[PDB]
Amino acid sequence: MEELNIIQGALELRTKTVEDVMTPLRDCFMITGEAILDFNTMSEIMESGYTRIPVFEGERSNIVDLLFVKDLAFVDPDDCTPLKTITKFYNHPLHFVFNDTKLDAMLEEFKKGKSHLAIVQRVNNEGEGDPFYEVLGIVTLEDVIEEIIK
Amino acid sequence: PVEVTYKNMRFLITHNPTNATLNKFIEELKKYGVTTIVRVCEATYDTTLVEKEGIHVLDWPFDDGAPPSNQIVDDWLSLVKIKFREEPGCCIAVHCVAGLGRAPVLVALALIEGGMKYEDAVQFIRQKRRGAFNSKQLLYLEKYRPKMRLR
Numbered sequence A: 001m002e003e004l005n006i007i008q009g010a011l012e013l014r015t016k017t018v019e020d021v022m023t024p025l026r027d028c029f030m031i032t033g034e035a036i037l038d039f040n041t042m043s044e045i046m047e048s049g050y051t052r053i054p055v056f057e058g059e060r061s062n063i064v065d066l067l068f069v070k071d072l073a074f075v076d077p078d079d080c081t082p083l084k085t086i087t088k089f090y091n092h093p094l095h096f097v098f099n100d101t102k103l104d105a106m107l108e109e110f111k112k113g114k115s116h117l118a119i120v121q122r123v124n125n126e127g128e129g130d131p132f133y134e135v136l137g138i139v140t141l142e143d144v145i146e147e148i149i150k
Numbered sequence B: 001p002v003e004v005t006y007k008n009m010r011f012l013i014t015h016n017p018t019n020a021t022l023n024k025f026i027e028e029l030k031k032y033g034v035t036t037i038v039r040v041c042e043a044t045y046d047t048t049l050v051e052k053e054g055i056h057v058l059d060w061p062f063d064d065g066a067p068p069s070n071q072i073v074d075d076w077l078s079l080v081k082i083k084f085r086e087e088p089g090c091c092i093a094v095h096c097v098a099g100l101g102r103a104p105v106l107v108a109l110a111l112i113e114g115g116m117k118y119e120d121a122v123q124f125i126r127q128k129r130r131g132a133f134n135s136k137q138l139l140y141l142e143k144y145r146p147k148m149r150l151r
């Protein structure tokens, strides 16, 4: 039944990685730091229905901050307040987890610690250039939850 | 921004700043107690403001993902030995625009030159930052003959 799916899902938390449950970067809904919060921008953010919205600067693979929708609360559309400003006010923690990370660990890291969101990155070892980190996309609590209720 | 401490010598490997972040950058570097900065990649900003704050900058670039030439290595060891004697307890900063390749290698050379084993050193480095070495660089540090130039 459903219980048996939960049980199986729970045992396979050791095996599975965050790379398996994650949302690819291409499918991520994000926002530029250079964005201005006006009627249109705020409305679009709200239209997406995402509580947590990654903020990138320049290339999308570069994520410099995180914007919750509750940050848009008393912000006025007619004021045209820059996004940099708001992010300066609240400044929500941004976690980066590696792709080889097990779901067990990721779950524990969500429980302790406030944040329900994490960024997936991997080490690029291709030769001969300097090894660098590569952002693949995001992984949230609802992701690791979904794996374990099938 | 990662701190490395061994014996009397202390190093700090940082991200590469932008031109505007200098205001917030100096604030960081003054906190760790840096004196000298070693730029091993490319020049991304005006060094004028930086040296104006009393922080000397050194540009010793070399090929991406490749071990540093003998020249750079000797100058590096000399720089370490001299600067740590000149002002005991200070710090030397290395950085690059890419990250994890060229900058930690110099630190590793100095580290194994200070009486640390190759394995124990690379482990100490990678523990603070995962990855941090490519194919070519691993070999360079593996087979590096220490001169014990620090003493």
Ligand SMILES: Nc1ncnc2c1ncn2[C@@H]1O[C@H](COP(=O)(O)OP(=O)(O)OP(=O)(O)O)[C@@H](O)[C@H]1O
Residues within 6 Å of the ligand: A022, A023, A027, A028, A029, A030, A049, A050, A051, A052, A053, A054, A116, A138, A139, A140, A141, A142, A143
């Ligand atoms: N901003 C976003 N852009 C793209 N994908 C997202 C975004 N937020 C979450 N996801 C993905 O959507 C799925 C559901 O995520 P989640 O439920 O956490 O979204 P949410 O509604 O913003 O937050 P909450 O869980 O608190 O309701 C997951 O696969 C997650 O990776």
Ligand SMILES: [Zn+2]
Residues within 6 Å of the ligand: A142
């Ligand atoms: Zn949800």
